[PDB]
């Protein structure tokens, strides 16, 4: 429910948050599963809008 | 007055709303990428289009 109802700008903010987490790598390994589930489900739901957007910064960060 | 057309895609669930109004995800009809969340009052199902005045302001919970 939560990840579904989350609107698109907040999706973008959430992606930048995950970027910050990866830089805070230790938390990444402390909570690997939950982050994976969140990320894959959010992108698999908002998939079409996210691919529709155009941002080289977004390209780099998803890389 | 610039009217806009949106396509109700997927009716949200488990959301704390009021009786008879619903959070719902709409996809712009002439711009098949942008999505917004709006509040609807009548009955509705997926995949059906709707008229909007406020083409920009995203929506909130209504306590």
């Amino acid at each position: 429910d939560a990840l579904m109802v989350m609107p698109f700008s907040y999706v973008l903010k959430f992606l930048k948050f995950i970027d910050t987490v990866m830089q805070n790598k230790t938390l990444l390994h402390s909570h690997l599963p939950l982050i994976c589930k969140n990320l894959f489900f959010i992108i698999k739901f908002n998939h079409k809008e996210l691919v529709s957007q155009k941002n080289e910064e977004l390209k780099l960060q998803i890389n | 007055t610039p009217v806009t057309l949106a396509k109700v895609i997927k009716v949200l669930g488990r959301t704390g709303s009021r009786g008879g109004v619903t959070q719902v995800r709409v996809e712009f009809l002439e711009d098949t990428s942008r999505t917004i969340v709006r509040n609807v009052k009548g009955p509705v199902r997926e995949n059906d289009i709707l008229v909007l005045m406020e083409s920009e302001r995203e929506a909130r919970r209504l306590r």
């Binding site: 429910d1 939560a2 990840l3 579904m4 109802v5 989350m6 907040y10 | 959301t15 704390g16 919970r61």
Partner: peptide, 11 residues
């Protein structure tokens, strides 16, 4: 109080 989803939204 608040509901889930929205909680994460403000946080």
């Amino acid at each position: 109080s608040l509901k889930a989803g929205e909680r994460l939204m403000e946080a």
